[PDB]
């Protein structure tokens, strides 16, 4: 009845509160240096406070056993905005510093940031079920879904600034190949030469991600890297000077026609990675065969 507005007041206290907690719990993970939690749990301690507050918070609200289903509605209208604000914050928080943690100086922390980002995605998710579900709110979930879709856009684009970081490294060793490549006038072991410099990337790096990312982490950090691999080598070798600022300006075609087999099972990971439909189908290595035809 009228119990209804007071607790709209909690609610907005709740916000309120959730949303300092969550500060603490990022600023004490933060100074701990984002330690995945175990072996098997690959997020860390900020993810677990975050979500485990945000559950004390519903279980209370449910605790508050309501009949009537229009009250009951209006409050997880409420709630849902403090979980995407509070989520959404965590996102940006995360954001913001992410550029700034990409040193292979120490490379873990991206990985468990992107590998948060998600487990805010999942928990979500969890805690959708928790409201009802479909019977939930209409208001309530709405504005909910759109929180998953903003999430989802968070990590596209962590993973996106994650692989960017390794541009340069990347462009750098695509060079060394173009040269040792040119040096050929067998086929299969001047692809192991000519893959030398990059191998170092395709070898541990992807290992790493390996055993740390998250499937949906893994996925599209591999996806980014790829594009990064397929395009530098493009620009490098291929293309005529007049189409690449790469190009500080044969029958060697065939070398890079097995090194991209070798490289695509790289990305493949004996299906851990990238999968070679994906890899098949993908229009930056269709791109590459094309300059790779062309010249």
Avoid at 39 to 56: G, I, K, M, R, Y
Avoid at 119 to 128: A, I, P, S
Avoid at 282 to 295: E, G, H, M, T, V
Wanted: proline share 3%; glycine share 4%.
């Amino acid at each position: 009845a009228w119990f209804e507005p007071f607790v709209i007041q909690w609610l907005d206290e709740n916000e309120e509160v959730s949303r300092d907690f969550l500060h603490g719990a990022l600023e004490r993970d933060k100074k701990d240096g984002f330690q995945q939690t175990s072996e098997h749990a690959l997020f860390s301690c900020s993810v677990v406070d975050v979500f485990s507050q945000l559950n004390q918070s519903f279980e209370i609200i449910k605790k508050l056993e309501c009949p009537d289903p229009q009250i009951v509605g209006h409050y997880m209208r409420r709630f849902a905005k403090t979980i995407s604000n509070v989520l959404l914050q965590y996102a940006d928080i995360v954001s913001k510093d992410f550029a700034s943690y990409c040193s292979k100086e120490k490379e873990k922390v991206p990985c468990i940031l992107m590998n948060n980002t998600q487990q805010l995605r999942v928990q979500l998710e969890k805690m959708f079920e928790a409201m009802g579900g479909k019977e939930l709110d209409a208001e309530a979930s709405g504005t909910l879904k759109e929180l998953q879709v903003k999430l989802n856009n968070v990590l596209d684009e962590l993973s996106h600034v994650f692989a960017t970081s390794f541009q340069p490294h990347i462009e750098e060793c695509v060079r060394q190949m173009g040269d040792i490549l040119s040096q050929v006038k067998s086929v299969a072991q001047d692809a192991d030469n000519v893959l030398q410099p990059i191998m170092d990337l395709l070898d541990s790096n992807l290992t790493l991600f390996a055993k740390i990312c998250e499937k949906t982490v893994l996925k599209r950090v591999l996806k980014e890297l790829w594009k990064l691999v397929m395009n530098t080598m493009e620009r490098t070798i291929v293309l005529p000077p007049e189409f690449s600022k790469l190009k500080d300006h044969p029958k060697q075609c065939a070398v890079v026609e097995l090194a991209l087999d070798t490289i695509k099972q790289y990305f493949h990971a004996g299906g851990v990675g990238l999968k070679k439909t994906f890899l098949e189908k993908s229009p930056d290595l269709q791109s590459l065969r094309y300059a790779l035809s062309l010249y």
